[PDB]
Amino acid sequence: DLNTEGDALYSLRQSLKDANNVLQSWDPTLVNPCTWFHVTCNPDNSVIRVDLGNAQLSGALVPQLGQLKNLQYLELYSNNISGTIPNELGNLTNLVSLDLYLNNFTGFIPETLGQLYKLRFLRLNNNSLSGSIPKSLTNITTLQELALDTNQLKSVPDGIFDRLTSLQKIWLHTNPWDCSCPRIDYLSRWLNKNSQKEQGSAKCSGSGKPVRSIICPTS
Ligand SMILES: *[C@@H]1O[C@H](CO)[C@@H](O)[C@H](O)[C@H]1NC(C)=O
């Protein structure tokens, strides 16, 4: 009897590279993945988390990874993983902490990420992700720590941080932010009002000025 969490998780092993044989213990033929290393299950024998951090893993993620609904913590951080973040990660409803940081990830940040309403922690940082933030992120009210730092990020949608009332720490620094007015108006004002929330200094592109220091004129 196939597990379907194990099948979903094995689809990841097929597309990744170790080379440390980290995933050697992932056997889909077992009744459940709960006995796998780097995998933890609840008393109901479903996968609530995956810690692959620092496994020296290369390759790309897979859309089948969204098949784990009870997945709470996904730690993929500190690897060589490339490609784009799958939209199917928006199908993890019970996802609390999503850590993709310190990887090669390219492309846009998925808009379906705004479908995680239990997500309290999002770290996409130290990646190649290209500039914008999904407007749907405002739908995460439980967001506390958001780290986007060290990426290709450029702009931000107006009023996106307004519905995040639980936001504590945020990392926007080391990004090619567009400080031209009146695009940078919201972010500059938000980073100044919320400056206790920001960790590090977000610098404007080519000027080197902090985003918060920018004051946009009307007319
Ligand atoms: C989302 O997950 C549920 C259960 O985990 C599954 O039944 C459904 O097909 C998934 N949908 C997509 C689009 O992945």
Atom of ligand 1 nearest to the CA of 69: 5
Determine which residue's CA is closest to atom 9 belonging to ligand 1: 67
Torsion of CA 144, 148, 153, 159, to 10 degrees: 0
What does 104-126 look like in DSSP terms, one character per residue?
--BSPPPGGGGG-SS--EEE--S
Tell me the structure's resolution in angstroms, rounded to a single decimal: 2.8
Determine which residue's CA is closest to atom 2 belonging to ligand 1: 67
Q: Is 100 exposed, middle or buried (0-12, 13-18, 19+ CB in 10 A)?
A: buried
Answer for the pair 117, 142: CB distance below 8 angstroms, yes or no.
yes
Number of domains in the chain: 1
- The number of angstroms, rounded, from the C-alpha of 62 to the middle of its chain's C-alpha atoms is 15
Q: Which residue among 68, 69, 116 is best mutated to probe the pocket of ligand 1, counting the most ligand atoms within 8 A of its Cβ?
A: 69
Closest CA to 134 of 113, 104, 116, 159: 113
**Ligand 1 centre distance from Cα of residue 95 (Å):** 14
Give 21's contacts (C-beta < 8 A, 6+ positions apart).
none
Q: How far apart (Å, rounded) are the C-alpha atoms in residues 184 and 125?
A: 21
Atom of ligand 1 nearest to the CA of 63: 14
Beta bridge partners of residue 177, listed in sequence order? 204
Strand runs labelled E in the chain: 16-17, 39-41, 47-51, 58-59, 73-75, 97-99, 121-123, 145-147, 169-171
Degrees, nearest 5: CA angle 202-102-194: 30
Atom of ligand 1 nearest to the CA of 68: 5
Q: In whole angstroms, how large is the CA radius of gyration of the chain?
A: 19
First to last CA, the chain: 69
Strand arrangement of the beta sheet that strand 47-51 belongs to: 39-41, 47-51, 73-75, 97-99, 121-123, 145-147, 169-171
Give the pair of three-digit tokens for residue 138: 């405002």
Range of the domain at 98: 1-219
Beta bridge partners of residue 16, listed in sequence order? 59
Q: What's the CATH number where 28 sits? A: 3.80.10.10
Q: Which residues of 185-208 are buried (b: 16+ CB within 10 A; e: fewer)?
A: bbbbebbeeeeebbeeebbbbeee
Q: Scanning the structure block, which residue is given the tokens 């990392």?
A: 171
| Main-chain phi, psi angles of 82, to 5 degrees | -115, 180
Give 124's contacts (C-beta < 8 A, 6+ positions apart).
85, 100, 101, 105, 109, 147, 148, 151
Q: How far apart (Å, rounded) are the C-alpha atoms in residues 75 and 140?
A: 19
Answer for the pair 93, 119: CB distance below 8 angstroms, yes or no.
no
